[PDB]
Amino acid sequence: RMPYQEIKNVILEVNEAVLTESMIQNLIKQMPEPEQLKMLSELKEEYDDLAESEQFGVVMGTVPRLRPRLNAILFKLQFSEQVENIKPEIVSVTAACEELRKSENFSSLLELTLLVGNYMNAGSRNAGAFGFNISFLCKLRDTKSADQKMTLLHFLAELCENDHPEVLKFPDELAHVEKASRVSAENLQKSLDQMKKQIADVERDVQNFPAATDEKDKFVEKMTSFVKDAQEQYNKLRMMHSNMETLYKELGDYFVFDPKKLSVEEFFMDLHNFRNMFLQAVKENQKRRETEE
Amino acid sequence: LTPKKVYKPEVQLRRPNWSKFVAEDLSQDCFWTKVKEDRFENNELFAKLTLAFSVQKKKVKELKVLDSKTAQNLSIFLGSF
Amino acid sequence: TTALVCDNGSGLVKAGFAGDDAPRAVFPSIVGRPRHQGVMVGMGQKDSYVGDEAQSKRGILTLKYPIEHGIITNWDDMEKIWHHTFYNELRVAPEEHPTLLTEAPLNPKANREKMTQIMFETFNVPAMYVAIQAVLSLYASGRTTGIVLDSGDGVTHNVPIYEGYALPHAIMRLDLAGRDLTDYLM
Amino acid sequence: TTALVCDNGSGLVKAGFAGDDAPRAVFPSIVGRPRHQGVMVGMGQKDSYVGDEAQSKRGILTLKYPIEHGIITNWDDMEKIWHHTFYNELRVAPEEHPTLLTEAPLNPKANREKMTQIMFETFNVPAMYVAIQAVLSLYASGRTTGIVLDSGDGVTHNVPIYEGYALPHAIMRLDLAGRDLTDYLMKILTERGYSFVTTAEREIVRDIKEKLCYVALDFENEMATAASSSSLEKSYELPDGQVITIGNERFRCPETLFQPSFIGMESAGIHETTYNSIMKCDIDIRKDLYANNVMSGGTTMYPGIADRMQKEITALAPSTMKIKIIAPPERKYSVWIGGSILASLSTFQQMWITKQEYDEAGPSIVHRKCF
Ligand SMILES: Nc1ncnc2c1ncn2[C@@H]1O[C@H](COP(=O)(O)OP(=O)(O)O)[C@@H](O)[C@H]1O
Ligand SMILES: Nc1ncnc2c1ncn2[C@@H]1O[C@H](COP(=O)(O)OP(=O)(O)O)[C@@H](O)[C@H]1O
Ligand SMILES: [Mg+2]
Ligand SMILES: [Mg+2]
Description:
In chain A, helix 2 packs antiparallel against helix 5, helix 6 runs parallel beside helix 10 and helix 8 packs across helix 11. The termini of chain A are far apart. By secondary structure, chain A is an all-alpha fold. By secondary structure, chain C is an alpha+beta fold. Chain C folds into 2 domains: 92 residues, Nucleotidyltransferase, domain 5 (2-Layer Sandwich), CATH 3.30.420; 42 residues, Actin, Chain A, domain 2 (Roll). Chain C contains 5 helices and 14 strands. In chain C, the strands form 4 sheets. Chain C has a 5-stranded mixed sheet. In chain C, strands 11, 12, 13 and 14 form a 4-stranded antiparallel sheet that branches. A 3-stranded antiparallel sheet of chain C has the order 5-4-6. In chain C, strand 11 and strand 12 form a beta hairpin. The radius of gyration of chain C is 18 Å and the shape is globular. Chains in contact: A-B, A-D, B-C, C-D. Bound molecules: adenosine-5'-diphosphate (2 copies) and magnesium ion (2 copies). One adenosine-5'-diphosphate binds next to helix 5 of chain C. Chain B: This is Protein diaphanous homolog 1. Chain B: Belongs to the formin homology family. Diaphanous subfamily.
């Protein structure tokens, strides 16, 4: 229910107090072809006789370069949502990588499981193993005993209840693991490459835009301030993703697992399920000790 | 570096079948070069790992053929009839 | 030992042993207390009469029903009903006897909480159970399925049971039974 | 010549003039009849009170809904609803204004036949139209394509429309909405000892459901929170002066929409209904419908529904495509707002069902003219 000259004035000013994301989304999705816009622009003399959609096309046909201009406006209003989707994924992986890096009680658990597991895998293919995968730790519960009453998870929880009562505070140190259990690294790379391509398309739009023939036309000042702000925020996002890729390659060296054999979301789903299985195993061992009393 | 301790237990034990990491893949600053798991070594732990991972009213009734639910609904029916 | 079945209905308490054809002690659940002036000293004048003794002497007593519409309002009166049906009528020791109880459907839960608390603390049985009345009526009829219209003195409820499963969502409760008919006849 | 938009839903009649932003007359669709013995002579004691007068004097009346499960059962009661919303609420003569009407999808056709016959014989307009409620809910969302979960008081239906084309084979219908939630709240309010059996008590329980109930995010975590501490309890003052307090039953009442096994319905939840309605469409058009979940009706006015809906659809759908839920705050009158948008258009002047078309084709041209 807006007048059509008001829609043109909001578009030509880039009136950010009026412009919203879903408005420009609905404007692009119902916009006709620029050949249809130029054919409507040939019939400006009969403006009182054309339809309401056709009177909208006469007013919109006067604005030049309309389809890459509206896509640059669409990428501008979606840039704040695209940073707020991409960045807390990267912070969640980086905080989970930094929490797993120091991780001294869980590192003593990793030394204890490797010593017990190499005694179990003695004479097998895994005999003399220097390390084992962190995503395999859900299957410590699958390693059952001969009487099938306790697991290897239940045996290691009972051993840490008896011998070393400082290992058991490991799963409260894993804080950003469940947030990093649903983050895909390839989708972060595809979105940042789409962000890098679209910033280059807006900066090509900015540089190919002509001089403003109106004092209302604030397209040159506001979009170049956006390109200066978006290139700063992408370089903040590219440095943090390079820090994310360095910390993933550092933990790829640290846990000696390949970066291509497992992504981030199956990495930390198994770590969050190992947190819930160990919390169940201590509560079941405390229940079994209270049952025996 | 040193190779890991080749244990030889008397009894074959149940094992978790992980994908093992050989010494050729290992980096210089990794976790598994700094593993000092022989401070956790115990013969009692290996013995436990070998040992574990190698009436005024008579109302019970033996059901040799029938199951629990069929004998319950029959005794409901025979108690009513 | 022999279990006890004690239907604590709204109007009549029916108590007896397990496996019997007829209930041993059928008596109305009233608590009678005197309202006039007692002039004769001695003579065994109790302050309360429970059961048939309150029915026999009802011309000088105010009678209170401890259960109204399946909900136990007065709980000390309900303890007096339970003590009278354990010690006077049935003449047993309830600390060495299991005791099943009945309950109307769509009841408030705190009635069952206080029933469990009284039956496990004051009248401390080795075991007890709370059962739905329509399931017991369908067991007494002999069939496994069917819909029971059970109407005691306060609660008139339709409960359908299919293959031994009591369906919860189709239980329909109407608070219109024999006490409302008695007041309408009055 | 201003047109009239009149949503005759199961919940409330929403009627008013076309071209406006809010409906002029929003009133519940009940007919109250007296059940006791009238003892005072004179003073104009009517035999039937229609609309808000039945709501005001509800302590002596038996209330009858003329629409049950989206289908008009009683017809003289619906004629009294139409006479009250034409002559008393809007206070205009109906035969000088065109009228737009709303209708549920998958309707029996004789409802449409009798609606056309009543509107062309009793309240005989020069022109009328019958529209689908989901198309009007999608028209007021500022768009053309998308899927509408329209949940009134009786009918909860998912209709996907792609590029203005309503797909008929993917329309799914579940008979679980706010009247059944109100009856389930009447069922679970007796667990605390607050019995509600009359039809006048159903309005009090519906006011409790409107004011105090909310959709939980996790069912088990909120149940453990309510079982742990009494921090979720809320108080309500009854019109006679009594005060009730409720705990977990604030969120167990709209949990039937996401778990329909509580009242004994075999079909799955509304998120699974939406997922099966989108999966009944083509594989190329699913990405537009994943980001265009538009909600409407008074049942979707809970302050917890969008996060639970987004979490359930994101757990259902694959994570490669974007999931977005559209929840405008004006979704209670969005059917009326879409009717006011559609009625004022110059393209809609050729789509009117006129008096001469009714005289030529009977009351059966509404099947072949509309969708
Ligand atoms: N022959 C009869 N005809 C009609 N009503 C009866 C008859 N016998 C008993 N009643 C009614 O049934 C009620 C007793 O029902 P009952 O199931 O014994 O109640 P409760 O078990 O709750 O004490 C009485 O209040 C009485 O009004
Ligand atoms: N804030 C609210 N929270 C929960 N339910 C509500 C709220 N507001 C209204 N409702 C429910 O929505 C219903 C109204 O829906 P409505 O859009 O009138 O459907 P219809 O038009 O099909 O009758 C009412 O019956 C009421 O129970
Ligand atoms: Mg009875
Ligand atoms: Mg409606």
